[PDB]
Design a protein around this ligand. Structure first.
Ligand code: ZHY
Length: 888
């Protein structure tokens, strides 16, 4: 149709590639995914239309709320007898005169209560009900739901910073008119044996093409469950890369029924010189998406070897044939049987598991042979029931011995009472045994649901099993809030890559949520779009962005404006850091102004939503304020007028830093972790103010960074311009600048705010291992709030040692009441993150599959164990932190 034609040009624009490339793809799974995922789209659209227009308004403008209405004592204590002074604005008559009405209301007041109060006071000045809604003055944020006013992030932030909440009273039909009508049109494209086999595992290696220049090459193979081998690495006989035709049948020490559903064939082509090196690699799922075992011949286009490849095989790598068909291919032949070998149904598995129970009690009572894995009845002592608890407490990176692993499996039936031990129990299973596995599948079909956070440990590279993964999705479906979903969106988008198939529960959960919450959808899109260049994931994400773009609605137009501006900034910075790179800053600027003033560049970058917070409108550009920065890689400091009619109550101007050349994934994770550390601290009752400024990677080493208003680097303060020098840098200079900025009842707050942000960042940088910190890495705001920029490296010793310049601001002139109070905060902060060690390990663990340099192995994540002192007791760790900290 005409509608469809127009749409695929639009989807194609936002996705980076045209829709018709997906049309021409002939792979059962791809066209099956393309079609099958449309019900999620329908489900999501129908949830939007289910309570039209309110539920549609909620989709586009979801309430931005904290996860709980409970205010920690220090947040509550800020309120005037548990009450908040709030200001309601009303735009009246033709001249759009802004009338304000200040109210003192309960912090837990519903928005509708607050509106009624504003109307009460509106009439009581001169001396309706559900016809109005509340909007945040200066940004596209609405308070459309019955949550208490304080539960909203804008209101809780206002309380904490001691800022006056300015809100605007808006007509419901004024917002409802601004809303478009959904039109999810269904696309054009939408219109045997089993476990019997008594054979061993054998696969033939025919030949390899596209291989040449420089001694002898062999094919190395392996059978894996995630990254754990289910047998021995079987290899082909060495051949020089002139005629690589082995045509030999490789035999493995696994029997066809003992193969788990998540079993993979991990192969590679290696070279020999005492010196072995991998050349090209490739992984295959031993079962397809319909659950059929691989039958016949196959041509696997292999992948280049990523630098720093520890082994000869890459089992953690992406499963499937490289899309670049002009790369080293490797033909294989697989054993044929009666017809088609499909994986047994859960019923067949249940009958075999109930047998692996009735005839296992017929193998312990009616066989003789011992296995320290046989579950014994009435032989579950309280002496070892506390031992299971002792194992369940341990961190995800804590090595579990063979003695402990055997003990756990034997007590599998008890472990249901302690559901948090599931990750330790699953790793205790012999996945190379169909008897143990069948018993486990059944325990998981009935396993009690665990917290979303614990269920995430099960969604990493260590747990490939579909039913283990399915349980984990069900836990996030039932217990994960939309707020916590926004927090872990980075790791959740990442774990998609580990999934064996295009169509899974994780993707359906994530897409549904993305298509039911435009805020979740926004970052979901950008997180996927930022990885389209990566040809390892480009397909999966390309299909996902298609299904998203079809059912996202009129927001696709808003995404296209963002994509167009982002490309013009890339193209501009491309020409600049190529044609004018070694030239002077005055020349680069001369060129920048000349180029930005072009008609096509002007309108692509004016009047669009900011990708950093889509609720922020970016109007006209303040070119007089747009400059190339003095900082490294030459970032582009951009300024935009805020077109909001009440911009003067939030920020008249919006400033974004456009970086082209540096990887921002590391800075993104650090700031996600910082934000999580801050929440842990705030809930726990410690007010360590952190500044997790917005950072978003938008492509291959391109990205955006939120400009922190009224802030300067440590160097900028220490100089006062350049009237001092690196030697002449007097230690008291920092405190003096702060003193001149804040005087009177203002000064005491400033020092407090400094010491607090100081204590938080000391603890944060130490745990995380954020090293190479200096005067151009640390920053301070006008109000004394400290923060850190450019997270160069992490995990690779005191990562941030206390400089005199800071301790002096902490007091005035090492042995002060302020330093004693300070030291305490750091000890208190350290102990709080230690109580959450299991979360941070998992969050980091889910990132190994992301192509990050300083997060490749479980040897990088182990650093968190050393800085948090997990092995030691809580009081023992304090002695460790005390020792590392007591060093000046
Ligand atoms: C770093 O130097 C400067 C910074 C800023 N301002 C701001 C405000 N909020 C944030 C940042 C920031 C954050 C992260 C990263 C990163 N990830 O690289 C880089 C910069 N920068 C202003 C400067 O001169 C006026 C300046 O040059 C001396």
């Amino acid at each position: 149709n005409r509608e469809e034609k127009i749409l695929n040009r639009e989807i194609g624009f936002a996705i980076g590639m045209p829709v018709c490339e997906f049309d021409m793809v002939k792979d059962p799974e791809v066209q099956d995914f393309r079609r099958n995922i449309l019900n999620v789209c329908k489900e999501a659209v129908d949830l939007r239309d289910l309570n039209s227009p309110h539920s549609r308004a909620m989709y586009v403008y979801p309430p931005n709320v904290e996860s709980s209405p409970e205010l920690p004592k220090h947040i509550y204590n800020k309120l005037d007898k548990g009450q908040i002074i709030v200001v309601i604005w009303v735009i009246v008559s033709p001249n759009n005169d802004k009338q304000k009405y200040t109210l003192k209301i309960n912090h837990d007041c519903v928005p509708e209560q607050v509106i009624a109060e504003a109307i009460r006071k509106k009439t009581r000045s001169m001396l309706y009900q559900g016809k109005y809604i509340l909007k945040v003055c200066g940004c596209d944020e609405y308070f459309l739901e019955k949550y208490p006013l304080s539960q909203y992030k804008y209101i809780r932030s206002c309380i904490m910073l001691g800022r006056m909440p300015n809100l605007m009273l808006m007509a419901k039909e004024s917002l409802y008119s601004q809303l478009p009508m959904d039109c999810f049109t269904m696309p054009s494209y939408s219109r045997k044996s089993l476990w019997v086999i008594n054979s061993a595992l054998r696969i033939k290696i025919l030949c390899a093409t596209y291989v040449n220049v420089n001694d002898k090459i062999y094919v190395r193979t392996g059978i894996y469950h995630g990254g754990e081998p289910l047998c021995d690495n079987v290899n082909t006989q060495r051949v020089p890369c002139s005629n690589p035709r082995w045509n030999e049948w490789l035999n493995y020490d696994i029997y066809i029924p003992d193969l788990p559903r998540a079993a993979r064939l991990c192969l590679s082509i290696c070279s020999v010189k005492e010196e072995h090196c991998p050349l090209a690699w490739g992984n295959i799922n031993l079962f397809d998406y319909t659950d059929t075992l691989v039958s016949g011949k196959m041509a696997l286009n292999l992948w280049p070897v990523p630098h720093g490849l520890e082994d000869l095989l890459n089992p953690i790598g992406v499963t499937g044939s490289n899309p670049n068909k002009e790369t080293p291919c490797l033909e294989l032949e697989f054993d044929w049987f009666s017809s088609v070998v499909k994986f047994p149904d859960m019923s067949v598995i249940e009958e075999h598991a109930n047998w692996s129970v009735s005839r296992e009690a017929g193998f312990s009572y009616s066989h003789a042979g011992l296995s320290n894995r046989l579950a014994r009845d009435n032989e579950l002592r309280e002496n070892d029931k506390e031992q299971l608890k002792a194992i369940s407490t341990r961190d995800p990176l804590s090595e579990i011995t063979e003695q402990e692993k055997d003990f756990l499996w034997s007590h599998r039936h008890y472990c249901v009472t302690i559901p948090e031990i599931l990750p330790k129990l699953l790793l205790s299973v012999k996945w190379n045994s169909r008897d143990e596995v069948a018993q486990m599948y059944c325990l998981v079909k009935d396993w009690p649901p665990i917290k979303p956070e614990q269920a995430m440990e099960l969604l990493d590279c260590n747990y490939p099993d579909p039913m283990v993964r399915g349980f984990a999705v069900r836990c996030l479906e039932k217990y994960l809030t939309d707020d916590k979903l926004s927090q872990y969106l980075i790791q959740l988008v990442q774990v998609l890559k580990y999934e064996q198939y295009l169509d899974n529960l994780l993707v359906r959960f994530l897409l549904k949520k993305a298509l039911t919450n435009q805020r979740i959808g926004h970052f979901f899109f950008w997180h996927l779009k930022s990885e389209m260049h990566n040809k390892t994931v480009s397909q999966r994400f390309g299909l996902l962005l298609e299904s998203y773009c079809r059912a996202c609605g009129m927001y696709l137009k808003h995404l296209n404006r963002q994509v167009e501006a982002m490309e013009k900034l890339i193209n501009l910075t491309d020409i600049l850091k190529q044609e004018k790179k070694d030239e002077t800053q005055k020349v680069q600027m001369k060129f920048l102004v000349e180029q930005m003033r072009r008609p096509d560049f002007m309108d692509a970058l004016q009047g669009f939503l900011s990708p950093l917070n889509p609720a922020h409108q970016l109007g006209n550009l303040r070119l007089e304020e747009c400059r190339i920065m003095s900082s490294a890689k030459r970032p582009l400091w951009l300024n935009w007028e805020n077109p909001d009619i009440m911009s003067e109550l939030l920020f008249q101007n919006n400033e974004i830093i456009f970086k082209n050349g540096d990887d921002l994934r590391q800075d993104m994770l650090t700031l996600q972790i910082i934000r999580i550390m801050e929440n842990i601290w705030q809930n726990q009752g410690l007010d360590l103010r952190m500044l997790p400024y917005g950072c978003l990677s938008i492509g291959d080493c391109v990205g955006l960074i939120e400009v922190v208003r009224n802030s300067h680097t440590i160097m900028q303060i220490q100089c006062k311009g350049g009237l001092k020098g690196a030697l002449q840098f007097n230690s008291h200079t920092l405190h003096q600048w702060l003193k001149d900025k804040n005087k009177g009842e203002i000064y005491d707050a400033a020092i407090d705010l400094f010491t607090r942000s100081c204590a938080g960042y000391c603890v944060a940088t130490f745990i995380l291992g954020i090293g190479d910190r200096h005067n151009s890495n640390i920053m301070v705001k006008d109000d004394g709030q400290l923060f850190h920029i450019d997270f160069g490296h992490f995990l690779d010793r005191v990562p941030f040692v206390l400089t005199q310049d800071f301790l002096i601001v902490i007091s005035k002139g090492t042995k002060t009441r302020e330093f004693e109070r300070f030291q305490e905060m750091c000890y208190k902060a350290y102990l709080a993150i230690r109580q959450h060690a299991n979360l941070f390990i998992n969050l980091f663990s889910m990132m190994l599959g992301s192509g990050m340099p300083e997060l490749q192995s479980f040897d990088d994540i182990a650093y968190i164990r050393k800085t948090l002192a997990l092995d030691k007791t809580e009081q023992e760790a304090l002695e460790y932190f005390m020792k590392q900290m007591n060093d000046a």
